[PDB]
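Hi there. Long-time user, first ticket. I'm pasting a complex I've been working with (about 1284 residues overall). I'd like to know whether the download I got is complete or cut off, because the file seemed smaller than I expected. Thanks.
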Amino acid sequence: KKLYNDFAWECLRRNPQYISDWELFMKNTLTNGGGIPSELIQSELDLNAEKKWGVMKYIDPYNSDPTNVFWSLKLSNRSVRVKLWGDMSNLPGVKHQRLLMHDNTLCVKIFSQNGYFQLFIXXXXXXXXXXXXXXXXXXXXXXXXXXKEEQYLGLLKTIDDRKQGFSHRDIASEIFGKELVKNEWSADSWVRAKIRYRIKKANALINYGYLNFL
Amino acid sequence: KKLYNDFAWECLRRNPQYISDWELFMKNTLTNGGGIPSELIQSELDLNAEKKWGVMKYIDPYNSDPTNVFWSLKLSNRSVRVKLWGDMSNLPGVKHQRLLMHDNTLCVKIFSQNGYFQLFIXXXXXXXXXXXXXXXXXXXXXXXXXXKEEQYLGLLKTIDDRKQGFSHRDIASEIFGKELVKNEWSADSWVRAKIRYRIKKANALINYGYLNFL
Amino acid sequence: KKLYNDFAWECLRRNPQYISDWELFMKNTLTNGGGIPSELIQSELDLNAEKKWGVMKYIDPYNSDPTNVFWSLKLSNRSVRVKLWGDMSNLPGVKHQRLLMHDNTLCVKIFSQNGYFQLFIXXXXXXXXXXXXXXXXXXXXXXXXXXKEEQYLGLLKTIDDRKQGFSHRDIASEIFGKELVKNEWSADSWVRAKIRYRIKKANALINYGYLNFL
Amino acid sequence: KKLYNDFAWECLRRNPQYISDWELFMKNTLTNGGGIPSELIQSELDLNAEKKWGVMKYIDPYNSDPTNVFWSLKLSNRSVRVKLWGDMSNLPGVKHQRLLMHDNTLCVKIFSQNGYFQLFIXXXXXXXXXXXXXXXXXXXXXXXXXXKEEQYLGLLKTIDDRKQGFSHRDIASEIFGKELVKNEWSADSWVRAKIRYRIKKANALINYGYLNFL
Amino acid sequence: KKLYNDFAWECLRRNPQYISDWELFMKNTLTNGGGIPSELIQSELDLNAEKKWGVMKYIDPYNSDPTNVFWSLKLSNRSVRVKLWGDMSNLPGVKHQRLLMHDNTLCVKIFSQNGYFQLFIXXXXXXXXXXXXXXXXXXXXXXXXXXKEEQYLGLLKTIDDRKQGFSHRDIASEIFGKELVKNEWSADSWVRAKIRYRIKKANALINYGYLNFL
Amino acid sequence: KKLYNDFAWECLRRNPQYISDWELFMKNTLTNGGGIPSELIQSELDLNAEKKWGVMKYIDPYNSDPTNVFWSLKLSNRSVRVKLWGDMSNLPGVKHQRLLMHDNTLCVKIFSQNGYFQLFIXXXXXXXXXXXXXXXXXXXXXXXXXXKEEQYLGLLKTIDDRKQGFSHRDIASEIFGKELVKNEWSADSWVRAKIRYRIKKANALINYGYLNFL
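Hi, the file is complete. Here it is re-exported in full:
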């Protein structure tokens, strides 16, 4: 089952350029390569996506489950470097997924219903010694996992409506009602401007604005 | 003096389309209209900018002081409707600016060194009665004014470097050093990918991503 | 069943002048008026009681259940003005009662086991904008309802003992014991002074002192 | 100078029966007794006032300074029994006053700008051992002294206006304005009912309602 | 069953001099006295142990249950003087034990799974009146009972290993492993110094260092 | 000036065996070695003291200033391993001292008026990743330094009195008074037992009991 929701992945998988990239990645691996890309191994093609989109591995954009969605250490604010486990990784209600990277570094994601956290490899982590710093909030976030976004997802729903063929007025009627739209829709109307603002907000998130959520 | 910094305004005033819009707005008002646009009155041309960019009045993009930068009620999460003052508006260290809107509604912004807050017109405000809701956080934000963003501004600094003519490698040397760049710059290098990610992050903020900060 | 206890009503319904007023109100409505006064409608006679005693409707003083006991907006510190619900009014454990006032204003009381709260008419309330004010405590009190007084009720129990015909010494024996009273009762004895202080405390509450508890 | 304000004393000294009692107490001590009643010693006449009014010593009702106003142990919720000091009693900003009682018990009041506290006689106090009890709040109140009431005093101001000869309408004009009163004053008017409610509230406090504030 | 663990008793009952004292106390009472020492009565011989070891009664050092282990008022930081109960002493999960002392003072210990507390004789206790003092922490500790030490007990386990005949190297192998000890054991080795430090730490606790834990 | 007080050092420097060890260490270095032991370098003789007493360097027991008193990593609960500073080490009111160890590891002590903290070598520290662990309290203790013990020092004062030649009765008179001692001193007296308990408590601290305070 889908444990958690990755909002940045919901933005990225709706990017038309990423969808085109993934379909190209599938075609050259199914008809020009070794075949189908559980045992996650980052290839060279996947590292191109990490340097371009942020995900360490090309993930099917049709699937909302972010189990195999790993975010680059160069971008993630929910990752730590760990040196050398069974206690943290086997709580009834906490799952984990592993990924072997191109530089032979092992990334393990710890996730539950409250989010995810990535560990790049007892368990010891080198925390930067900065007095009165919010760098310790990473440990608090990991504890919350082992223990506006509803409006943001509604913006992505509007993008799904557009790509289905619905017009701005169609989406306006869906949100405000047929009677309100017939009475107020105009050239410089505020109902039209609100729907346009929904598109602009979501487009900015989809066109790499999701990077600011990592 | 510049009391506070409006991060959304720092994004918007760097938008090339908004800069072009403002220069067009100045030309048709200086050579085709009544002349120069302290006594802020929202005209019809200003309301077009409110429905397009979010600011209730065209503001010179060259000035960082957000004194006369007013944000639309349709977008602002720092605004309330107030019905009918001298105590709140005259604290030593708290300033205020007024704007008369096209619909004859008066908007008064209360700001200090900790941010701004807009009041749309004793003083009584109709707060929505929702049990266990964060709608009361608006009153807490107003109290904080009457009593990552350093990284976000650094992203906009990179946009200023680009518009000046500096290349991606030039900006990479500015941040990481000439020696590191000469050794590591390549086609699919991570230093080049980091600089590209800076541009993408800032571009998303500039291209209406600032709306998610209102 | 009796959900909560209104201490101010316990004081008022023990007032001999109010009891006489209610019996007069019943006689002129049962033998001179339309008959018996679930569908609470404030008449002109009830508004006389609101301007005299504080309750918006004459309530039988023999009943301790304060379901239909409504307190005047001119006196209540547990009331708000609300403009235009099913979520707040239908929690398993929270009841409500309505009253239509003489000025056609609808008062709805929301009560549970932790107290009551009155709303005078989504749901929006005009809260006075006063910085660093305890006016927001009304919302906290309403949240506590939707989520010394044992000594004060003992004082009213002493009034019930007096109206039954028990003397001050009888009540002293009831509280301190027959042996203590026989040994210590005197003209200027402290046991007699304590019982007198009980009466004075309760009489002050009954003779409009309950108004300070609204 | 007057350090603090005793609200219960402000109620009691406005009681006409207490004022008559004090004037009788002065006459029988100035023309029938030893003369004038700094060295506070509770006599037999003072103990009659303690059993009747609550103050351990007859105090001039014309003086608002509650320095020599001591409240009976039988009524005070701000008193403790102490067994056997210079550290607590000599803080720059904390004063103290002593009273020798008729039963040879010494009462010492510790007061500052935040209130008063009475000690009835190192310093050790026998606190009742009750689990999860608010009896320890007496120590917190004493710490606050060594470290609605503005509306209540306004009610007593209305009593001062009445005893000066001002009518209910005069006081209504003082609070609401001459124009409002001339327009709204009537037989069953709400402006008249509000002023009547002020009197009733204050009268209840004055007629032994202050006992509930000790 | 054993409700709680008294760490000071775990130190004292491992003291060789106390074990010798108890065996002498048993011999002179079983072959020279009245016989066997539920009804705890402190004799003169027991008071010698109170002035020497701290326990008000000689307790068999072989038993870890500290039910009858009472600590002297001259040493205990978990004791109060109480003057004159059924509510506190009969919570489902809270037990109590009584001891009659040589000076006819009754000591009652209240204990549960969270520790013990001793009362030396309603229930009233004379608390010292000291402003901003931690003397009130005794009431908080008693409330916690009515509602490093795992490392310290491991130090006493090392003493048990020594008295059984195990050498320092034997205990080193028990803690660090046979392979580590064979490789690192030397004259001035750190593994030998760590085991020596364990002994010194525990010996200090056993040789009256437990007094600092009362 | 002496910034802070090291209680464990106050115990250790009063140890007669350590004082003898230090005098032997001085004699073999002043008449058999290189001479006098600001530039702290741990020699082989100093490491013998680290494995025996805990201090990384022999310190003159006559000096109470614990500036050059360093505690072994094998014993200190106020030390961390740090990998590679000017911000933390140069606060107006925070000093630091360095020591080069026999294994070429550099130990730097950061201390102020609130205590000391040792760092064994930006600045990064490998913190053990244990969920719901008190290992993070080391960072809180370091923050407190960069931002019963009065009774324990009184116990060491009693040891100073003994080594000066004062008897147990002399110390009893010093604490309780000449009159109390002359009246109560006996064979099995409690005043004599209290003084004996002071000695036993302090002796346990001095004879390696200080290790439990590191």
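A couple of notes from our side: The longest helix of chain C spans residues 190-206. The radius of gyration of chain C is 20 Å.
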